[PDB]
Subunit: 387 residues, 4 copies
C-alpha cells in the first residue's frame, strides 16, 4: 500500500544499486551488474528512471564501434521498459589525470580533458533523452594551501560552466545544469562545500537561468549542517533542479545509507518540504546497500528507499491536517495588523512611526511559543501513535 | 619588533576584552570594565579602534538624558585617544523578546522591535563615526522544524535588510552592511549558517552593492569547514567588508580563543590571503581571554592577538620570497599554450578542436605535483627553521 | 495509555525543569521555581524521584540555621508526595574558585575546597535518602597544554575519589559512586571524555566495587560517538549505576533536548538495550525545555520525556516478537557446531586443529547477512506501520 | 641537522610508503612497490624499522613454496640493511569474509578464520624478529543495531585475545599485544572506539600484563577528541606499547596526513609528552603521501615525517628550559603545605579537620593562572621567534 508509481519520479543511479561494495579497507563483496540487467530490475521495482556517469555505461578506453553497440543495446532496454534517463554527469573523479582537480587542475591540459569529457557526456545524455546535467566537483579541493590556488579556482570553473552552457545552447540541447556541493572527500576540503557556496557562484555565470542546485542529504549532514534549511534556501531561490536522497551519521566518511534509515525526523520534514512546495523534479536515491549484503539485499535496499519515502509523505500529510496542530500553528503565526504597518517597504514616515511606536515588550518577553508541545505532537505522529 | 601600528587596523569589540568570563556552567570570574577605561587601555596597546553593540554602551532601559551623558563621555575618550569606532551592530540576541528570532520571529511586534533596535544603533553609530554595520543573526534559527518557518524566513530578513539600507541612504549615513554567518549556537541550527549562504542572499536584496560579508574564523571552524576557502570566495566576489579573527577547535561550542593559538597553519595562510589580496578593512579580534585569567591576563590576550598576526604576516612574506618555493610554484602553474587555446570563451570551432584534440593523458597520469615538498617547506618556515 | 508509574523510575534533576533559560548569549526567559513547588508538580506528573546539586537546594553562603529550615521544608514536601531523592551530586563547576579545575586544580587549597564540598553533599544526600552519588568533572580539563598538567590529573582524582569512598564507608553511608564523562564544555576538552575513560579509571581506585558509570546521551553524541555501544560496554562491565537521558544533534554545544525528540532510532535501540538488560536504576532526564517556552511548556517537556520513553519501550517489545524478525535473527546468529570446537578456551591441539582446518571461505565470502531487510523492518516498526 | 638515527626508532609500515593512492572515488595513481625495494629505501632514509600485515608480504592465496621464497628474500634484505621489523598485525579487514566482522562476525566459521589468520601472522612475525603484535578492529562495528550484536561482541573478542596470548606463551613468542582503537571507518561505528574503551577491555582479559595500547593520532582526532589527553592516560596506566603518528583534520574520513603537517601545536605537545615520559617504543608513521604525488613525493613525505618530529623535539626541549616559562609553571604549581595535610589518604580526623578548615576562598576566586601568557610563550617558541 506504499507502492511506487512513475508520478513519484524515483530514480536510481547505475552506480547506486550497481555498487560492488569495495571500500578503502576492503575488497568488492558483490559482482558487477550489467546495465541492461539493472534497467529491467528497476523497472520491476517501480522506478521512474535511471541516471549514469559516462563511465558507468562506457568504460574508459572503449573503441567507438563498441561504444555504439553498448548504447544501442541500452536504449532498447529503456524502450522495452519505459524507463527514462533524467540525469547524466561526467565522471571527473576517477581518472588519475584528475588527481589535483578536474576544472581546478593547474595544468591546462587537464582542464581541457575535464572539459571535453563533459561535452561528450552531454552528447551521450542527449542521445538518451536526458534533461538534467549534474556537476559534482569531487576532485575540486585542496589539502595544500601553500599553492595559493584558492584564489584562482573561481574563474577556472566559471570558464567551463559558461563554456558548457554555451555549447549546449549551440547544439540545441535542453539541459538544465545542476551543481552538487560536498564539504570534503575525496579531498581534505572541497572548494564548493555548501549549498550557499554553489548558489552564490551561479549568480556570476553568464547564463544563470540555466543553472541550479543538486543538494545531497549526506553531503550537508557530513558537516553537521541542517539539510532542511539548505533546501529551503534553494527552493526560495527557485534553484532546486534535482535532489539526491540518502542517510548519513554526522561528521565522518560518506556513508550513503538507505533513505530515512538513520535520521527519521529530518527525512520527515524534508519530504514535507519537498511535497508541499510542489517540487516536480526527480527524487534520486544516491545511496548503496550495506557492505554486508548480497544481491537480494541490494533490491531490498532499493525497495526500502522508495517505501520509506511514501510512508513519510502520507504521514506528513496527516500531521498537517491535525486540528491541534492547526490550532498551534495559527496561534504562533498570529499577526497583529497594528504591528504590520510598521513593517514592509521603507518610507520616511514609517521609520518615524516605528521609532515613536510604543511596543508591547513585557508581553512579548513572557510569551511562550508552545514548540515543545508542537514538537512532541510531530514525534507522536512519526511514531504512528497519532497517524 | 612586532608592534601594532594604526595602519594595521586592529580592532577590539568592547565585549571581547570586556568579557566577564561567565559561561553556561559558571559565574563571572572578572569585574565589568568601564567603556572609557577600555578605550584608554586599547589605545595604549596600539589598537586602531573599538567596536560595540548598542547594549555594550547603553544598557537596556537607560533614560535618554542618561543615554546622552554616556555617549558624551565616550566620545571625549575617543577624542583624547584618537581611537576610531569602525563598526557597530545591534544586539538582537539578549532580550528575551528575541527568544524565537529577531527578524525571523513569527510575531510581527517582535520583528518591529528588532527593526527599531537596528535603526537606533545605526543612529548611535553615525554619532560615533562608524562606517560598517554588522548583522549577526544569532537568534535566527530553529530547533523545531514542525512550524514550517524555514519557508518564510528568507523574505522576512530581505524585508528589514532592505528597509535598513533604505533608511541609511535616506539619512545620508555611509554604512556598508556586513553580514555574519554562524552554523549554530545559541540556536540548534542558524538559518544563515555559511559564508555561501549569506553571499547568495545578498544577490536578492534591493541595494546589493551596499551589502557584504563579515566571516568569523570560529564560526566556519565550528562546523569543520575551511575558513580559507570561504574567505577566498568572499574576496573573489568583492564582498569582504570586515573580518572577525580568533581561534577554535572544530565541532563544539564557540570558544573564541586568542588568534593563532590553536590552528597556526590556518592562521598563517589566512593572514597570507588577506595581506596579499590588498584587503583594507578592519582586522577585528572577536575573542575573549581564557576563563582562568585575571585582568592582567586579559591584556596579555589582547597583546597576543596582534603580535601573533604580525609574526605570521612577516613569515608569510618571507615564505613567498624563497627561491625553492618560487621554483616549485612555477613548475606546477606551468601552462602549455597549446592547451590554452582549447580554453576560455566558447566558439563552435573551439569545441570541435577540443573534441578532436589528441591529449597527453599518460603524461598527466604519471605527473606528481610535488605538494608534499611544498607543504613541508611551509611547515619548516612556520617553525622558523627557515624563516 | 502511556502513563508513568513509579516502577518506571523516572527522575528529574531540580535543575532540569527548574532551568531559567539563560544561555551564553541571552537572559533568563523564565522565573526561578521554588524546590517545594517542583516536588509537587513532578509528583503530579508521575515521577519516581527528584535529584539535586547542593547549590540547587542551598545556595552558596546560606547560614546553617537557614540551611536547616530549607532542608526541613523540603523533606516535608517529599513526605507529603512520596517522591524519592535517588541521586545527589556536588556542584563543582559554578564557583569561580573552580576556574581551572575542582579536583584537578593545581592549587591544593582549591582541591581541598572541592573535596569538602563533596563530603558535605554526601551528608545532605544521606539526610535525604540518596543512594547514588554522581561525579561530573565539568571543570576538569584544559585549553592550555603547556602546563603539562595532563600528566598529573589522574593521581589527583584517584585521591579524592578514594577519600570520598572511605569517608562514606566510615560514616556508614550506602552510596554507590557514579562517574559521568563528557568530551568537552565548559572546558575546551575535558580529561575524562568518554565512557571508556571512566571505566578504565575505576579499575585503579581502591574500592572499585563502589564505583560505576553515569553515561549521558548528549555527552557521547556531542562527539559523534555511538551511545548504544558505550552503554553496552558499561552494562557488560556491570557498571551502569545510573543513566542520563536526553537528545542532542552531533558536534556542537550541549543542547539537552527532550528525550527521543531528535534521534528516534538511537533512542529506540537504547530503550531496548536498557529494558532487555534488566537495568533497574533510575531513568533520569537531564534535559531542559526549549528557551522558547513558558512554564506550561516546561511541564509539556517533562510529560513528553516520559511518554516518549514508554512508547518506545512498548514498540521495541513488539518489534522483538515479530515472526519475520525472529526468523531473520535466527539465520544470522546461525552457528555450525563444527566451527565452535575450534573456538573458546586455548589448547595446544585446538590450535593445531584450527591451523589444519579446511574453512568454507568462498561460502562465507558470498554470504549476505540481510541487514538491509532487518533495518527496514525496524524503521517500519518505529514508524508504526507494523507495530 | 635534523637527521634520523636508529635511537629515534622511526618505523614505517610497508603499506604507508607503499600506498598506491587509490581512494573510494579514484584509481591508483602510483605503482605497487616491491617490499625488498622499500626496505632499501627506508634504510637510506634512516628508519629503524619496517612493519607489515601478513598480506603486505604474502598476498592471499600464495602456495607455501612461494610463500617461503618471499620470506627468504625479505629476510636477506633486512640482513643487508640492518632494518628491524618491530611490529606485525593480521589483516582482518580486506577479505570479503570479514564483511560483518572478524572477531565479531556472527558466523563462528568467520571468527575461526579471523583467528587462524592471526596465529599465522604471529608465526611470520616471530620468523622476522617482531616483538609487538597489533590488533586493529577495523571491521568490528555496526550500522544495524537491530541485531542486538552489541551485547555479544565483548565476550567474542575476549575469547580470541585470550586465545592469542595463550598460543604465544605456549610457543615461547615474546609478543606484547597492542590494541588500536578507531571511532569509525570502514564501519559506521567501530565498537572499540576510544583509548579508554580499549584500556577498560584489557582489565578483563586473562593475561592483562601482556596487553597494551597502540593509539593513533588520526583516529582520536577524527572524532574531535584530544589525543594528548588520551595518550597521557595510557602512559599513566603503563600501557603505551606502540604509537601511530600522523595528521588529520577533525570530523571526516581518515586522511593519514604527514606528521605535524596540520596540527603543529598538538604534535608539539605530543612529542613533548612522549619524550619527557621516557617512552621507548617505536615511533611509527602510519601515514601516506598525498594522492597528488609521484614516487619522489613519497620519499619527501617519508623524510618530512621524521624531520618534523626531530624539529619539535628540539623545540619542546628549549621551551622547557626558558626561565620565564619555569617561573610561570612554578607559580601555578605553587602548593601551600597547610593545604596539603587536608589532602591525600583518608583518616577520620583529616575529614574532620577539612570540614572545620577555614578556606581562603575569595583569594582563590580572584586568582588568575596566567595561562594566556604561558600559551603565547609556547606559540612564540613554536614559531621560532624565541627558540
Amino acid at each position: 500500500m506504499y507502492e511506487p508509481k512513475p508520478e513519484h519520479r524515483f530514480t536510481f543511479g547505475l552506480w547506486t544499486v550497481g555498487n560492488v561494495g569495495r571500500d578503502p579497507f576492503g575488497d568488492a563483496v558483490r559482482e558487477r551488474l550489467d546495465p541492461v540487467y539493472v534497467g529491467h530490475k528497476l523497472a520491476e521495482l517501480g522506478v521512474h528512471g535511471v541516471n549514469l556517469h559516462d563511465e558507468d555505461l562506457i568504460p574508459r578506453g572503449t573503441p567507438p564501434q563498441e561504444r555504439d553497440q553498448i548504447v544501442r543495446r541500452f536504449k532498447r532496454a529503456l524502450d522495452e521498459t519505459g524507463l527514462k534517463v533524467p540525469m547524466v554527469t561526467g565522471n571527473l573523479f576517477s581518472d588519475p589525470g584528475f588527481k589535483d582537480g578536474g576544472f581546478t587542475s593547474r595544468d591546462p591540459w587537464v582542464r581541457a580533458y575535464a572539459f571535453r569529457k563533459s561535452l561528450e557526456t552531454m552528447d551521450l545524455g542527449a542521445e538518451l533523452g536526458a534533461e538534467i546535467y549534474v556537476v559534482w566537483p569531487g576532485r575540486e579541493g585542496a589539502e595544500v594551501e601553500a599553492t595559493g590556488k584558492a584564489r584562482k579556482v573561481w574563474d577556472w570553473v566559471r570558464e567551463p560552466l559558461n563554456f558548457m552552457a554555451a555549447y549546449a545552447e549551440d547544439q540545441g540541447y535542453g539541459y538544465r545544469f545542476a551543481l552538487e556541493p560536498k564539504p570534503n572527500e575525496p579531498r581534505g576540503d572541497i572548494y564548493f562545500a555548501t549549498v550557499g557556496s554553489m548558489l552564490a557562484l551561479i549568480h556570476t555565470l553568464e547564463r544563470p537561468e540555466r543553472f541550479g542546485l543538486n543538494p545531497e542529504f549526506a553531503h550537508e549532514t557530513m558537516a553537521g549542517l541542517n539539510f532542511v534549511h539548505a533546501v529551503a534556501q534553494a527552493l526560495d531561490a527557485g534553484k532546486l533542479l534535482h535532489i539526491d536522497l540518502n542517510g548519513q551519521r554526522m561528521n565522518r566518511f560518506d556513508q550513503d545509507l538507505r533513505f530515512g534509515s538513520e535520521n527519521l525526523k529530518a527525512a520527515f520534514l524534508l519530504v514535507d518540504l519537498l511535497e508541499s512546495s510542489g517540487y516536480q523534479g526527480p527524487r534520486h536515491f544516491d545511496a548503496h546497500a550495506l557492505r554486508t549484503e548480497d544481491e537480494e539485499g541490494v533490491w531490498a535496499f532499493a525497495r526500502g528507499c522508495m517505501r520509506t519515502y511514501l510512508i513519510l509523505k502520507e504521514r506528513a500529510e496527516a500531521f498537517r491536517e491535525d486540528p491541534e496542530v492547526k490550532e498551534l500553528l495559527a496561534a504562533y503565526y498570529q499577526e497583529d495588523p497594528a504591528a504590520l504597518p510598521l513593517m514592509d517597504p521603507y518610507s520616511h514616515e514609517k521609520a518615524e512611526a516605528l521609532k515613536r511606536a510604543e511596543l508591547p515588550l513585557e508581553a512579548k518577553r513572557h510569551r511562550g511559543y508552545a514548540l515543545e508541545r508542537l514538537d512532541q505532537l510531530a514525534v507522536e505522529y512519526l511514531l504512528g501513535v497519532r497517524g
